[PDB]
Each structure stands twice: as C-alpha cells, then as structure tokens.
mmCIF file of C-alpha atoms in Angstrom:
data_model
loop_
_atom_site.group_PDB
_atom_site.id
_atom_site.type_symbol
_atom_site.label_atom_id
_atom_site.label_comp_id
_atom_site.label_asym_id
_atom_site.label_seq_id
_atom_site.Cartn_x
_atom_site.Cartn_y
_atom_site.Cartn_z
ATOM 1 C CA UNK A 19 16.192 11.857 -40.165
ATOM 2 C CA UNK A 20 15.120 13.030 -36.703
ATOM 3 C CA UNK A 21 12.285 11.497 -34.675
ATOM 4 C CA UNK A 22 11.000 12.930 -31.388
ATOM 5 C CA UNK A 23 8.611 10.972 -29.161
ATOM 6 C CA UNK A 24 6.692 12.559 -26.281
ATOM 7 C CA UNK A 25 4.353 9.892 -24.921
ATOM 8 C CA UNK A 26 1.929 9.620 -21.996
ATOM 9 C CA UNK A 27 0.576 6.117 -21.400
ATOM 10 C CA UNK A 28 -1.540 4.770 -18.557
ATOM 11 C CA UNK A 29 -1.007 7.693 -16.180
ATOM 12 C CA UNK A 30 -3.525 8.355 -13.408
ATOM 13 C CA UNK A 31 -4.060 11.758 -11.774
ATOM 14 C CA UNK A 32 -6.282 11.768 -8.706
ATOM 15 C CA UNK A 33 -6.854 15.494 -8.231
ATOM 16 C CA UNK A 34 -5.256 18.625 -9.698
ATOM 17 C CA UNK A 35 -6.004 21.964 -8.034
ATOM 18 C CA UNK A 36 -4.646 25.403 -8.971
ATOM 19 C CA UNK A 37 -1.780 23.839 -10.928
ATOM 20 C CA UNK A 38 -0.151 24.559 -14.276
ATOM 21 C CA UNK A 39 1.466 22.336 -16.923
ATOM 22 C CA UNK A 40 0.459 18.978 -15.433
ATOM 23 C CA UNK A 41 0.785 15.836 -17.532
ATOM 24 C CA UNK A 42 1.402 17.822 -20.714
ATOM 25 C CA UNK A 43 3.787 17.559 -23.658
ATOM 26 C CA UNK A 44 5.477 20.774 -24.790
ATOM 27 C CA UNK A 45 7.634 21.008 -27.903
ATOM 28 C CA UNK B 10 12.470 13.783 -42.945
ATOM 29 C CA UNK B 11 11.374 14.871 -39.463
ATOM 30 C CA UNK B 12 8.580 13.222 -37.467
ATOM 31 C CA UNK B 13 7.251 14.547 -34.152
ATOM 32 C CA UNK B 14 4.904 12.473 -31.988
ATOM 33 C CA UNK B 15 2.935 13.941 -29.079
ATOM 34 C CA UNK B 16 0.651 11.191 -27.791
ATOM 35 C CA UNK B 17 -1.780 10.784 -24.888
ATOM 36 C CA UNK B 18 -3.042 7.234 -24.375
ATOM 37 C CA UNK B 19 -5.160 5.773 -21.590
ATOM 38 C CA UNK B 20 -4.689 8.641 -19.134
ATOM 39 C CA UNK B 21 -7.215 9.171 -16.341
ATOM 40 C CA UNK B 22 -7.828 12.519 -14.625
ATOM 41 C CA UNK B 23 -10.064 12.400 -11.568
ATOM 42 C CA UNK B 24 -10.728 16.100 -11.007
ATOM 43 C CA UNK B 25 -9.201 19.302 -12.388
ATOM 44 C CA UNK B 26 -10.022 22.587 -10.650
ATOM 45 C CA UNK B 27 -8.778 26.088 -11.507
ATOM 46 C CA UNK B 28 -5.871 24.633 -13.487
ATOM 47 C CA UNK B 29 -4.235 25.473 -16.803
ATOM 48 C CA UNK B 30 -2.558 23.358 -19.502
ATOM 49 C CA UNK B 31 -3.497 19.945 -18.097
ATOM 50 C CA UNK B 32 -3.098 16.864 -20.275
ATOM 51 C CA UNK B 33 -2.484 18.940 -23.398
ATOM 52 C CA UNK B 34 -0.099 18.804 -26.348
ATOM 53 C CA UNK B 35 1.524 22.086 -27.383
ATOM 54 C CA UNK B 36 3.689 22.448 -30.479
ATOM 55 C CA UNK C 19 8.749 15.719 -45.718
ATOM 56 C CA UNK C 20 7.613 16.690 -42.214
ATOM 57 C CA UNK C 21 4.855 14.927 -40.269
ATOM 58 C CA UNK C 22 3.495 16.126 -36.920
ATOM 59 C CA UNK C 23 1.177 13.945 -34.830
ATOM 60 C CA UNK C 24 -0.845 15.287 -31.896
ATOM 61 C CA UNK C 25 -3.074 12.454 -30.692
ATOM 62 C CA UNK C 26 -5.505 11.925 -27.810
ATOM 63 C CA UNK C 27 -6.698 8.338 -27.395
ATOM 64 C CA UNK C 28 -8.791 6.757 -24.658
ATOM 65 C CA UNK C 29 -8.375 9.561 -22.121
ATOM 66 C CA UNK C 30 -10.922 9.955 -19.325
ATOM 67 C CA UNK C 31 -11.608 13.244 -17.523
ATOM 68 C CA UNK C 32 -13.840 12.999 -14.471
ATOM 69 C CA UNK C 33 -14.593 16.666 -13.812
ATOM 70 C CA UNK C 34 -13.138 19.938 -15.107
ATOM 71 C CA UNK C 35 -14.043 23.158 -13.290
ATOM 72 C CA UNK C 36 -12.873 26.707 -14.049
ATOM 73 C CA UNK C 37 -9.928 25.356 -16.046
ATOM 74 C CA UNK C 38 -8.304 26.325 -19.332
ATOM 75 C CA UNK C 39 -6.588 24.321 -22.088
ATOM 76 C CA UNK C 40 -7.426 20.849 -20.761
ATOM 77 C CA UNK C 41 -6.975 17.848 -23.032
ATOM 78 C CA UNK C 42 -6.385 20.016 -26.099
ATOM 79 C CA UNK C 43 -3.980 20.006 -29.038
ATOM 80 C CA UNK C 44 -2.415 23.347 -29.972
ATOM 81 C CA UNK C 45 -0.244 23.850 -33.042
ATOM 82 C CA UNK D 1 19.840 9.895 -37.364
ATOM 83 C CA UNK D 2 18.817 11.216 -33.940
ATOM 84 C CA UNK D 3 15.975 9.800 -31.837
ATOM 85 C CA UNK D 4 14.743 11.349 -28.584
ATOM 86 C CA UNK D 5 12.315 9.501 -26.306
ATOM 87 C CA UNK D 6 10.425 11.203 -23.473
ATOM 88 C CA UNK D 7 8.030 8.630 -22.028
ATOM 89 C CA UNK D 8 5.608 8.494 -19.095
ATOM 90 C CA UNK D 9 4.188 5.040 -18.383
ATOM 91 C CA UNK D 10 2.033 3.823 -15.511
ATOM 92 C CA UNK D 11 2.667 6.787 -13.209
ATOM 93 C CA UNK D 12 0.188 7.570 -10.435
ATOM 94 C CA UNK D 13 -0.255 11.030 -8.897
ATOM 95 C CA UNK D 14 -2.457 11.178 -5.816
ATOM 96 C CA UNK D 15 -2.958 14.926 -5.448
ATOM 97 C CA UNK D 16 -1.309 17.982 -7.012
ATOM 98 C CA UNK D 17 -1.975 21.388 -5.451
ATOM 99 C CA UNK D 18 -0.585 24.781 -6.501
ATOM 100 C CA UNK D 19 2.238 23.082 -8.407
ATOM 101 C CA UNK D 20 3.878 23.677 -11.775
ATOM 102 C CA UNK D 21 5.421 21.350 -14.374
ATOM 103 C CA UNK D 22 4.374 18.058 -12.767
ATOM 104 C CA UNK D 23 4.595 14.862 -14.794
ATOM 105 C CA UNK D 24 5.286 16.737 -18.029
ATOM 106 C CA UNK D 25 7.646 16.333 -20.977
ATOM 107 C CA UNK D 26 9.414 19.479 -22.188
ATOM 108 C CA UNK D 27 11.573 19.590 -25.308
ATOM 109 C CA UNK E 19 23.444 7.965 -34.527
ATOM 110 C CA UNK E 20 22.470 9.392 -31.133
ATOM 111 C CA UNK E 21 19.608 8.090 -28.985
ATOM 112 C CA UNK E 22 18.414 9.756 -25.774
ATOM 113 C CA UNK E 23 15.972 8.015 -23.427
ATOM 114 C CA UNK E 24 14.143 9.832 -20.628
ATOM 115 C CA UNK E 25 11.710 7.344 -19.101
ATOM 116 C CA UNK E 26 9.302 7.325 -16.150
ATOM 117 C CA UNK E 27 7.827 3.913 -15.341
ATOM 118 C CA UNK E 28 5.663 2.816 -12.430
ATOM 119 C CA UNK E 29 6.350 5.834 -10.216
ATOM 120 C CA UNK E 30 3.903 6.745 -7.450
ATOM 121 C CA UNK E 31 3.526 10.252 -6.002
ATOM 122 C CA UNK E 32 1.333 10.518 -2.923
ATOM 123 C CA UNK E 33 0.911 14.285 -2.655
ATOM 124 C CA UNK E 34 2.616 17.264 -4.303
ATOM 125 C CA UNK E 35 2.028 20.722 -2.826
ATOM 126 C CA UNK E 36 3.476 24.058 -3.973
ATOM 127 C CA UNK E 37 6.257 22.268 -5.858
ATOM 128 C CA UNK E 38 7.895 22.735 -9.247
ATOM 129 C CA UNK E 39 9.395 20.311 -11.783
ATOM 130 C CA UNK E 40 8.264 17.086 -10.100
ATOM 131 C CA UNK E 41 8.437 13.823 -12.027
ATOM 132 C CA UNK E 42 9.133 15.602 -15.313
ATOM 133 C CA UNK E 43 11.462 15.080 -18.266
ATOM 134 C CA UNK E 44 13.272 18.160 -19.576
ATOM 135 C CA UNK E 45 15.410 18.135 -22.711
ATOM 136 C CA UNK F 14 -14.405 -14.582 -23.750
ATOM 137 C CA UNK F 15 -12.603 -11.386 -24.786
ATOM 138 C CA UNK F 16 -9.867 -11.347 -27.437
ATOM 139 C CA UNK F 17 -8.194 -8.032 -28.327
ATOM 140 C CA UNK F 18 -5.442 -8.281 -30.946
ATOM 141 C CA UNK F 19 -3.244 -5.639 -32.565
ATOM 142 C CA UNK F 20 -1.138 -7.140 -35.361
ATOM 143 C CA UNK F 21 1.445 -5.243 -37.415
ATOM 144 C CA UNK F 22 3.445 -6.797 -40.254
ATOM 145 C CA UNK F 23 4.234 -3.953 -42.676
ATOM 146 C CA UNK F 24 6.370 -0.829 -42.520
ATOM 147 C CA UNK F 25 4.847 1.823 -40.245
ATOM 148 C CA UNK F 26 6.057 5.430 -40.293
ATOM 149 C CA UNK F 27 2.997 6.875 -38.539
ATOM 150 C CA UNK F 28 0.740 6.391 -35.521
ATOM 151 C CA UNK F 29 -1.303 3.253 -34.801
ATOM 152 C CA UNK F 30 -3.477 3.547 -31.697
ATOM 153 C CA UNK F 31 -6.101 1.243 -30.189
ATOM 154 C CA UNK F 32 -8.408 1.978 -27.248
ATOM 155 C CA UNK F 33 -10.895 -0.492 -25.761
ATOM 156 C CA UNK F 34 -13.428 -0.323 -22.914
ATOM 157 C CA UNK F 35 -15.197 -3.596 -22.091
ATOM 158 C CA UNK F 36 -17.825 -3.735 -19.350
ATOM 159 C CA UNK F 37 -16.484 -0.675 -17.540
ATOM 160 C CA UNK F 38 -17.916 2.379 -15.800
ATOM 161 C CA UNK F 39 -15.821 5.148 -17.348
ATOM 162 C CA UNK F 40 -16.084 8.798 -16.345
ATOM 163 C CA UNK G 10 -11.195 -15.417 -20.102
ATOM 164 C CA UNK G 11 -9.336 -12.290 -21.235
ATOM 165 C CA UNK G 12 -6.608 -12.380 -23.894
ATOM 166 C CA UNK G 13 -4.877 -9.125 -24.885
ATOM 167 C CA UNK G 14 -2.139 -9.504 -27.505
ATOM 168 C CA UNK G 15 0.104 -6.954 -29.208
ATOM 169 C CA UNK G 16 2.170 -8.575 -31.966
ATOM 170 C CA UNK G 17 4.781 -6.789 -34.081
ATOM 171 C CA UNK G 18 6.740 -8.463 -36.880
ATOM 172 C CA UNK G 19 7.575 -5.706 -39.387
ATOM 173 C CA UNK G 20 9.772 -2.620 -39.329
ATOM 174 C CA UNK G 21 8.307 0.125 -37.128
ATOM 175 C CA UNK G 22 9.588 3.705 -37.285
ATOM 176 C CA UNK G 23 6.563 5.258 -35.563
ATOM 177 C CA UNK G 24 4.307 4.906 -32.525
ATOM 178 C CA UNK G 25 2.206 1.831 -31.708
ATOM 179 C CA UNK G 26 0.052 2.257 -28.606
ATOM 180 C CA UNK G 27 -2.611 0.050 -27.023
ATOM 181 C CA UNK G 28 -4.894 0.913 -24.097
ATOM 182 C CA UNK G 29 -7.422 -1.463 -22.532
ATOM 183 C CA UNK G 30 -9.941 -1.163 -19.684
ATOM 184 C CA UNK G 31 -11.769 -4.376 -18.759
ATOM 185 C CA UNK G 32 -14.389 -4.383 -16.007
ATOM 186 C CA UNK G 33 -12.982 -1.300 -14.292
ATOM 187 C CA UNK G 34 -14.348 1.831 -12.636
ATOM 188 C CA UNK G 35 -12.206 4.512 -14.270
ATOM 189 C CA UNK G 36 -12.397 8.195 -13.373
ATOM 190 C CA UNK H 4 -8.110 -16.222 -16.502
ATOM 191 C CA UNK H 5 -6.182 -13.166 -17.717
ATOM 192 C CA UNK H 6 -3.467 -13.388 -20.383
ATOM 193 C CA UNK H 7 -1.661 -10.201 -21.458
ATOM 194 C CA UNK H 8 1.056 -10.707 -24.077
ATOM 195 C CA UNK H 9 3.353 -8.253 -25.847
ATOM 196 C CA UNK H 10 5.369 -9.989 -28.573
ATOM 197 C CA UNK H 11 8.013 -8.318 -30.740
ATOM 198 C CA UNK H 12 9.921 -10.106 -33.503
ATOM 199 C CA UNK H 13 10.811 -7.431 -36.079
ATOM 200 C CA UNK H 14 13.083 -4.399 -36.101
ATOM 201 C CA UNK H 15 11.695 -1.567 -33.962
ATOM 202 C CA UNK H 16 13.060 1.975 -34.208
ATOM 203 C CA UNK H 17 10.080 3.643 -32.514
ATOM 204 C CA UNK H 18 7.828 3.418 -29.462
ATOM 205 C CA UNK H 19 5.658 0.416 -28.564
ATOM 206 C CA UNK H 20 3.526 0.966 -25.466
ATOM 207 C CA UNK H 21 0.817 -1.136 -23.821
ATOM 208 C CA UNK H 22 -1.432 -0.148 -20.910
ATOM 209 C CA UNK H 23 -4.012 -2.425 -19.280
ATOM 210 C CA UNK H 24 -6.510 -1.996 -16.430
ATOM 211 C CA UNK H 25 -8.412 -5.141 -15.423
ATOM 212 C CA UNK H 26 -11.021 -5.018 -12.663
ATOM 213 C CA UNK H 27 -9.533 -1.930 -11.026
ATOM 214 C CA UNK H 28 -10.817 1.272 -9.441
ATOM 215 C CA UNK H 29 -8.617 3.861 -11.147
ATOM 216 C CA UNK H 30 -8.714 7.568 -10.338
ATOM 217 C CA UNK I 21 -4.932 -16.995 -12.834
ATOM 218 C CA UNK I 22 -2.945 -14.017 -14.139
ATOM 219 C CA UNK I 23 -0.250 -14.366 -16.811
ATOM 220 C CA UNK I 24 1.619 -11.249 -17.980
ATOM 221 C CA UNK I 25 4.311 -11.885 -20.595
ATOM 222 C CA UNK I 26 6.652 -9.529 -22.443
ATOM 223 C CA UNK I 27 8.615 -11.382 -25.128
ATOM 224 C CA UNK I 28 11.284 -9.827 -27.352
ATOM 225 C CA UNK I 29 13.138 -11.729 -30.075
ATOM 226 C CA UNK I 30 14.075 -9.145 -32.725
ATOM 227 C CA UNK I 31 16.410 -6.163 -32.840
ATOM 228 C CA UNK I 32 15.093 -3.246 -30.772
ATOM 229 C CA UNK I 33 16.533 0.259 -31.119
ATOM 230 C CA UNK I 34 13.598 2.035 -29.458
ATOM 231 C CA UNK I 35 11.358 1.941 -26.392
ATOM 232 C CA UNK I 36 9.129 -0.989 -25.402
ATOM 233 C CA UNK I 37 7.023 -0.308 -22.310
ATOM 234 C CA UNK I 38 4.278 -2.308 -20.599
ATOM 235 C CA UNK I 39 2.067 -1.193 -17.705
ATOM 236 C CA UNK I 40 -0.553 -3.370 -16.001
ATOM 237 C CA UNK I 41 -3.027 -2.809 -13.154
ATOM 238 C CA UNK I 42 -4.992 -5.884 -12.054
ATOM 239 C CA UNK I 43 -7.584 -5.632 -9.286
ATOM 240 C CA UNK I 44 -6.020 -2.533 -7.740
ATOM 241 C CA UNK I 45 -7.227 0.737 -6.236
ATOM 242 C CA UNK I 46 -4.981 3.232 -8.022
ATOM 243 C CA UNK I 47 -4.995 6.958 -7.313
ATOM 244 C CA UNK J 29 -1.725 -17.734 -9.141
ATOM 245 C CA UNK J 30 0.314 -14.833 -10.538
ATOM 246 C CA UNK J 31 2.992 -15.311 -13.205
ATOM 247 C CA UNK J 32 4.914 -12.265 -14.472
ATOM 248 C CA UNK J 33 7.582 -13.027 -17.078
ATOM 249 C CA UNK J 34 9.960 -10.770 -19.000
ATOM 250 C CA UNK J 35 11.878 -12.736 -21.637
ATOM 251 C CA UNK J 36 14.568 -11.296 -23.913
ATOM 252 C CA UNK J 37 16.376 -13.312 -26.586
ATOM 253 C CA UNK J 38 17.349 -10.822 -29.314
ATOM 254 C CA UNK J 39 19.739 -7.891 -29.523
ATOM 255 C CA UNK J 40 18.485 -4.890 -27.535
ATOM 256 C CA UNK J 41 19.989 -1.424 -27.992
ATOM 257 C CA UNK J 42 17.095 0.453 -26.373
ATOM 258 C CA UNK J 43 14.864 0.491 -23.297
ATOM 259 C CA UNK J 44 12.584 -2.366 -22.216
ATOM 260 C CA UNK J 45 10.504 -1.557 -19.139
ATOM 261 C CA UNK J 46 7.729 -3.455 -17.359
ATOM 262 C CA UNK J 47 5.548 -2.215 -14.492
ATOM 263 C CA UNK J 48 2.896 -4.291 -12.717
ATOM 264 C CA UNK J 49 0.442 -3.603 -9.880
ATOM 265 C CA UNK J 50 -1.574 -6.607 -8.683
ATOM 266 C CA UNK J 51 -4.149 -6.225 -5.916
ATOM 267 C CA UNK J 52 -2.524 -3.113 -4.467
ATOM 268 C CA UNK J 53 -3.664 0.222 -3.055
ATOM 269 C CA UNK J 54 -1.378 2.621 -4.919
ATOM 270 C CA UNK J 55 -1.321 6.367 -4.319
ATOM 271 C CA UNK K 21 -38.203 17.853 18.043
ATOM 272 C CA UNK K 22 -35.468 17.657 15.398
ATOM 273 C CA UNK K 23 -34.418 20.622 13.255
ATOM 274 C CA UNK K 24 -32.348 20.235 10.086
ATOM 275 C CA UNK K 25 -31.274 23.337 8.157
ATOM 276 C CA UNK K 26 -29.457 23.409 4.807
ATOM 277 C CA UNK K 27 -28.575 26.683 3.104
ATOM 278 C CA UNK K 28 -26.139 28.417 0.786
ATOM 279 C CA UNK K 29 -24.098 25.361 -0.201
ATOM 280 C CA UNK K 30 -22.285 25.390 -3.548
ATOM 281 C CA UNK K 31 -21.471 22.029 -5.152
ATOM 282 C CA UNK K 32 -19.242 22.004 -8.213
ATOM 283 C CA UNK K 33 -19.580 18.503 -9.653
ATOM 284 C CA UNK K 34 -20.877 15.221 -8.231
ATOM 285 C CA UNK K 35 -20.162 11.820 -9.793
ATOM 286 C CA UNK K 36 -21.484 8.439 -8.615
ATOM 287 C CA UNK K 37 -22.080 9.698 -5.080
ATOM 288 C CA UNK K 38 -24.759 9.030 -2.476
ATOM 289 C CA UNK K 39 -26.361 11.290 0.145
ATOM 290 C CA UNK K 40 -24.728 14.547 -0.960
ATOM 291 C CA UNK K 41 -26.203 17.845 0.190
ATOM 292 C CA UNK K 42 -29.251 16.128 1.684
ATOM 293 C CA UNK K 43 -31.126 16.073 4.986
ATOM 294 C CA UNK K 44 -31.224 12.337 5.672
ATOM 295 C CA UNK K 45 -33.325 11.159 8.605
ATOM 296 C CA UNK L 9 -34.119 18.676 20.873
ATOM 297 C CA UNK L 10 -31.416 18.350 18.207
ATOM 298 C CA UNK L 11 -30.328 21.230 15.972
ATOM 299 C CA UNK L 12 -28.285 20.704 12.807
ATOM 300 C CA UNK L 13 -27.151 23.726 10.788
ATOM 301 C CA UNK L 14 -25.346 23.660 7.431
ATOM 302 C CA UNK L 15 -24.390 26.870 5.646
ATOM 303 C CA UNK L 16 -21.905 28.496 3.302
ATOM 304 C CA UNK L 17 -19.964 25.367 2.346
ATOM 305 C CA UNK L 18 -18.194 25.260 -1.023
ATOM 306 C CA UNK L 19 -17.454 21.839 -2.533
ATOM 307 C CA UNK L 20 -15.221 21.664 -5.585
ATOM 308 C CA UNK L 21 -15.662 18.138 -6.930
ATOM 309 C CA UNK L 22 -17.026 14.926 -5.410
ATOM 310 C CA UNK L 23 -16.373 11.473 -6.882
ATOM 311 C CA UNK L 24 -17.704 8.146 -5.576
ATOM 312 C CA UNK L 25 -18.297 9.519 -2.082
ATOM 313 C CA UNK L 26 -20.980 8.984 0.546
ATOM 314 C CA UNK L 27 -22.519 11.350 3.110
ATOM 315 C CA UNK L 28 -20.836 14.551 1.919
ATOM 316 C CA UNK L 29 -22.178 17.914 3.035
ATOM 317 C CA UNK L 30 -25.257 16.273 4.544
ATOM 318 C CA UNK L 31 -27.177 16.367 7.819
ATOM 319 C CA UNK L 32 -27.342 12.656 8.617
ATOM 320 C CA UNK L 33 -29.459 11.616 11.590
ATOM 321 C CA UNK M 23 -30.040 19.463 23.690
ATOM 322 C CA UNK M 24 -27.368 19.001 21.012
ATOM 323 C CA UNK M 25 -26.218 21.793 18.700
ATOM 324 C CA UNK M 26 -24.200 21.141 15.541
ATOM 325 C CA UNK M 27 -23.017 24.083 13.434
ATOM 326 C CA UNK M 28 -21.230 23.884 10.073
ATOM 327 C CA UNK M 29 -20.203 27.026 8.207
ATOM 328 C CA UNK M 30 -17.656 28.537 5.852
ATOM 329 C CA UNK M 31 -15.810 25.340 4.929
ATOM 330 C CA UNK M 32 -14.075 25.104 1.549
ATOM 331 C CA UNK M 33 -13.432 21.625 0.132
ATOM 332 C CA UNK M 34 -11.221 21.312 -2.925
ATOM 333 C CA UNK M 35 -11.748 17.766 -4.185
ATOM 334 C CA UNK M 36 -13.177 14.625 -2.579
ATOM 335 C CA UNK M 37 -12.588 11.122 -3.953
ATOM 336 C CA UNK M 38 -13.892 7.840 -2.507
ATOM 337 C CA UNK M 39 -14.499 9.317 0.940
ATOM 338 C CA UNK M 40 -17.216 8.930 3.562
ATOM 339 C CA UNK M 41 -18.688 11.403 6.063
ATOM 340 C CA UNK M 42 -16.926 14.526 4.786
ATOM 341 C CA UNK M 43 -18.162 17.940 5.881
ATOM 342 C CA UNK M 44 -21.303 16.414 7.389
ATOM 343 C CA UNK M 45 -23.204 16.654 10.668
ATOM 344 C CA UNK M 46 -23.464 12.969 11.555
ATOM 345 C CA UNK M 47 -25.594 12.053 14.561
ATOM 346 C CA UNK N 12 -25.976 20.179 26.422
ATOM 347 C CA UNK N 13 -23.296 19.594 23.776
ATOM 348 C CA UNK N 14 -22.089 22.303 21.393
ATOM 349 C CA UNK N 15 -20.094 21.530 18.247
ATOM 350 C CA UNK N 16 -18.850 24.390 16.064
ATOM 351 C CA UNK N 17 -17.080 24.077 12.703
ATOM 352 C CA UNK N 18 -16.014 27.139 10.734
ATOM 353 C CA UNK N 19 -13.505 28.520 8.261
ATOM 354 C CA UNK N 20 -11.679 25.268 7.505
ATOM 355 C CA UNK N 21 -9.916 24.912 4.150
ATOM 356 C CA UNK N 22 -9.345 21.387 2.815
ATOM 357 C CA UNK N 23 -7.166 20.971 -0.254
ATOM 358 C CA UNK N 24 -7.749 17.397 -1.404
ATOM 359 C CA UNK N 25 -9.235 14.330 0.290
ATOM 360 C CA UNK N 26 -8.763 10.776 -0.999
ATOM 361 C CA UNK N 27 -10.284 7.595 0.458
ATOM 362 C CA UNK N 28 -10.746 9.167 3.886
ATOM 363 C CA UNK N 29 -13.424 8.885 6.559
ATOM 364 C CA UNK N 30 -14.841 11.448 9.005
ATOM 365 C CA UNK N 31 -13.017 14.493 7.625
ATOM 366 C CA UNK N 32 -14.259 17.961 8.520
ATOM 367 C CA UNK N 33 -17.389 16.571 10.175
ATOM 368 C CA UNK N 34 -19.217 16.903 13.487
ATOM 369 C CA UNK N 35 -19.545 13.248 14.473
ATOM 370 C CA UNK N 36 -21.676 12.447 17.511
ATOM 371 C CA UNK O 18 -21.806 20.929 29.139
ATOM 372 C CA UNK O 19 -19.167 20.218 26.485
ATOM 373 C CA UNK O 20 -17.929 22.834 24.014
ATOM 374 C CA UNK O 21 -15.969 21.927 20.884
ATOM 375 C CA UNK O 22 -14.673 24.700 18.619
ATOM 376 C CA UNK O 23 -12.923 24.250 15.262
ATOM 377 C CA UNK O 24 -11.790 27.238 13.217
ATOM 378 C CA UNK O 25 -9.239 28.509 10.728
ATOM 379 C CA UNK O 26 -7.516 25.194 10.008
ATOM 380 C CA UNK O 27 -5.806 24.704 6.643
ATOM 381 C CA UNK O 28 -5.306 21.134 5.405
ATOM 382 C CA UNK O 29 -3.134 20.572 2.358
ATOM 383 C CA UNK O 30 -3.819 16.988 1.304
ATOM 384 C CA UNK O 31 -5.364 14.002 3.087
ATOM 385 C CA UNK O 32 -4.954 10.407 1.893
ATOM 386 C CA UNK O 33 -6.477 7.288 3.473
ATOM 387 C CA UNK O 34 -6.930 8.970 6.850
ATOM 388 C CA UNK O 35 -9.605 8.820 9.537
ATOM 389 C CA UNK O 36 -10.953 11.479 11.917
ATOM 390 C CA UNK O 37 -9.085 14.457 10.457
ATOM 391 C CA UNK O 38 -10.193 17.979 11.312
ATOM 392 C CA UNK O 39 -13.350 16.665 12.975
ATOM 393 C CA UNK O 40 -15.212 17.145 16.250
ATOM 394 C CA UNK O 41 -15.602 13.528 17.344
ATOM 395 C CA UNK O 42 -17.740 12.867 20.411
#
C-alpha cells in the first residue's frame, strides 16, 4: 500500500520567461 | 493498492513567455 | 488496484505566449 | 505502507528568467 | 511504515535568473 | 454574507477538490 | 462577513483540497 | 469580518490543504 | 476583524497545510 | 484586529504547517 | 507644432491596462 | 516644436499597467 | 526644440508598472 | 535644444516599477 | 544643448524600482 502525493497549492508566479519545468509535478 | 496524486490547486501564473512544461503534471 | 489522479483545479493563467505544455496533464 | 509527500504551499515567485526546475516536484 | 515529507511553505523568491533547481523537491 | 463549507465524514480514498471565486476579477 | 470552513471527521486516505478567492484581483 | 477555520477530528493518512485569498492583488 | 484558526484534535499521520493572503499585493 | 491561532490537542505524527500574509507586499 | 510618430511596435498580450501603444495628447 | 518618435519596440506581455509604449504629452 | 527617440527596445514582461518604454513629456 | 535617444535596450521582467526605459522630460 | 544617449543595456529583472534605464530630465 503505497501512496505518493505531489501537490501545488496557492502558489503565485509573477512572470516566467524562457524557462523550463517551472511549477510542475513529474513522476 | 497504489495511489498517485498529482494536484494543482489555486495556482496563479501572471505571464508565461517562450517557456516549456509550466504548471503541468507528467506521469 | 491502481488509481492515478492528475487534477487541475482553480488555476489562473494570465497570458501564455509561444509556450508549450502549459497547464496540461500527460500520462 | 510507504507514504511520500512533496508539497508546495503558498510560495511566491516574482520573476523566473532562463531557469530550469524551479518550484517543481520530481519523483 | 516509512513516511517522507518534503514541504515548501510560505517561501518568497524575488528574482531567479539563469539558475537551476531552485525551490524544488527531488526524491 | 458568504459561507463556504467543505464537510467530510466518510472514508475517502480519492480526490475531493473545491474551488470558489466570489466577486473577483480573475485572469 | 466571510466564513470559510473545512471540517474533517472521518478517515481520509486521499487528497482534500480547498481554494478560495474572495474580492481579489487574481492574475 | 473574516473567519477562516480548518478543523480536523478524525484519522488523516493523506493530504489536507487550504488556500485563501481575500481582497488581494495576486500575480 | 480577521480570525484565522487551525484546530487539530484527532490522530494525524499526513500533511495538513494552510495558506492565507489577506489584503496583500503578492507577486 | 488580527488573531492567528494554531491549536493542537491530539497525537500528531506528520506535518502541520501554517503560512499567513496580512497586508504585505510580498515578492 | 507637435509631432507624434508611432510605428512598427509589436505587443504580445495586454490585460487590464490603460494608455498602451497610444499617442495621448 | 516637439518631436516624439516610437519605433521597433517589442512588448511581451503587459498586465495592469499604465502608459506603456506610448507618446504621452 | 525637443527631440525624443525610442527604438529597438525589447520588453519581456510588465506587471503593475507605470511609464514603461514611453516618451513622457 | 534637448536630444534624448533610447535604443537597443533589453529588459527581462518589470514588476511594480515606475519610469523604466522611458524618456521622461 | 543637452545630449542624452542610452544604448545596449541589458536588464535582468526589476522589482519595485523607480527611474531605471531612463533618460530623466
């Protein structure tokens, strides 16, 4: 019985320019 | 019994320019 | 018995320009 | 019985330029 | 019974330029 | 008056999400 | 008056998330 | 008046998250 | 008046997170 | 008036986090 | 005499803004 | 005489801003 | 006489700003 | 006579700023 | 006569600033 939690809650990102893998969940 | 949770809740992104894989869930 | 959850709830995106894979779920 | 928690709550990012793997969860 | 917690709460990042692995959880 | 309630009394093995926008300018 | 309540009394093995925006300018 | 309550009385083995924005300019 | 309460009375084996922004300019 | 309370009376084996921003300019 | 010239300006996306790319007098 | 020239300016994204890329007099 | 010239300026992202890339007189 | 020249300036990201990349007189 | 020249300036990120990369007179 294995449980994996990847959560994003109430996060604010002002500006994202020429970036990669920002605010993402990767399994 | 395996459970995987990838959640995005209440996230705000002001501006995203020329970016990749922003605010995404990848399994 | 395997359950996978990829959820997007209440997310706001102001502007998305020339970007790829933004706010998406990929399995 | 194994449980893994990767959480992001109430984080603010002013500006992200030409960066990689910012504010992300990787399993 | 093993539990691993990787948490980010109330963190503020003013500006992130040409950086890698900032404010991220890696398992 | 605004009253927003999320009540849980049973056994939950899945995802329960609630998103609310009251009198807001959301982009 | 604003009243936001999250009440949990049962057994939870999953994710319970709540997001609220009241009178805000969200981008 | 603003009242934000998170109440937990049962057995929790998962994630319980709450995010609130009241009268804010969020980017 | 602002009242923010987090109350816990049961047995918690997981994550309980609360994030609040009241009358703020968040970037 | 601002009242921020975190009350714990039960048995906690996990993480309990609280983040609050009241009338602030956060970047 | 007052001369105002506006040319060749590219605007990506404008949200809830005022007096953008205009000749205001 | 007053001369104002605006040319070849690229703007990515503008949010809740005032007097951006404008000839204000 | 007053001469104001604006050319070849690249702006990435502008949020809650005033008088950006403008010829203000 | 007053001459103001602005050219070839790259701005990455601007947040809650005033009089950025402008010819203010 | 007054001459102000601005060229080839790279700005990474600007937050809550005033009179940045500008020709103020």
